[PDB]
Design an enzyme around this catalytic site. Structure first.
Site, mmCIF file in Angstrom:
data_model
loop_
_atom_site.group_PDB
_atom_site.id
_atom_site.type_symbol
_atom_site.label_atom_id
_atom_site.label_comp_id
_atom_site.label_asym_id
_atom_site.label_seq_id
_atom_site.Cartn_x
_atom_site.Cartn_y
_atom_site.Cartn_z
ATOM 1 N N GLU A 35 -12.127 -14.413 22.072
ATOM 2 C CA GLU A 35 -12.146 -14.543 23.556
ATOM 3 C C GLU A 35 -11.114 -15.456 24.164
ATOM 4 O O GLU A 35 -10.436 -15.233 25.033
ATOM 5 C CB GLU A 35 -13.241 -14.944 23.941
ATOM 6 C CG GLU A 35 -14.570 -13.593 23.971
ATOM 7 C CD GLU A 35 -14.372 -12.618 24.806
ATOM 8 O OE1 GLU A 35 -13.462 -12.576 25.977
ATOM 9 O OE2 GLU A 35 -14.696 -11.431 24.720
ATOM 10 N N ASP A 52 -12.468 -14.795 33.996
ATOM 11 C CA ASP A 52 -13.021 -15.355 32.837
ATOM 12 C C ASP A 52 -12.648 -16.607 32.294
ATOM 13 O O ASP A 52 -11.547 -16.970 32.443
ATOM 14 C CB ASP A 52 -12.748 -14.276 31.432
ATOM 15 C CG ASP A 52 -13.117 -12.919 31.691
ATOM 16 O OD1 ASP A 52 -13.941 -12.548 32.590
ATOM 17 O OD2 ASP A 52 -12.909 -12.187 30.765
#
Ligand SMILES: [Cl-]
Ligand SMILES: [Cl-]
Ligand SMILES: [Cl-]
Ligand SMILES: [Cl-]
Ligand code: NA
Length: 129
Positions: A35, A52
């Site tokens: 991520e 994000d």
């Protein structure tokens, strides 16, 4: 902060992620690696106008408030900037909510594509836990 692998494993363990909703700690460290590259400061804009945030790339569409994702939610009741701290408490607490939301760790695209079904214990190999 850019964590080391075992450093992050320890932090995620102390904050209660190991086996949380049945996902062993390696799944969480794996997800963080792919991520954010273990970087608490990571941000990545999405096509829909959300972003994000943090080590686990938690999205402003549903989970945190960033002030620029209209019509979104803030289910973790936090500013998204909270997810960028060197201290991962906010990220982990928010991750617990996400993974509890029906969809498990499929909520993280990098976990689905790079960690699910793989030998995720590798990610906690060598660590003093
Ligand atoms: Cl594991
Ligand atoms: Cl806020
Ligand atoms: Cl921490
Ligand atoms: Cl699940
Ligand atoms: Na939001």
């Amino acid at each position: 902060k850019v964590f080391g692998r075992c450093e992050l494993a320890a932090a995620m363990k102390r904050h209660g992620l190991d086996n949380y909703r049945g996902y062993s700690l390696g799944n969480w460290v794996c997800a963080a690696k792919f991520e954010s590259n273990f970087n608490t400061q990571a941000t990545n804009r999405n096509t829909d106008g959300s972003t994000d945030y943090g080590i686990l790339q938690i999205n402003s569409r549903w989970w945190c408030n960033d002030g620029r994702t209209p019509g979104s939610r803030n289910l973790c009741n936090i500013p998204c900037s909270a997810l960028l701290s060197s201290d991962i408490t906010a990220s982990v607490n928010c991750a617990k909510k996400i993974v509890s939301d029906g969809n498990g760790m499929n909520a993280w695209v990098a976990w689905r594509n790079r960690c699910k079904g793989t030998d995720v214990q590798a990610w906690i190999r060598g660590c003093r836990l």
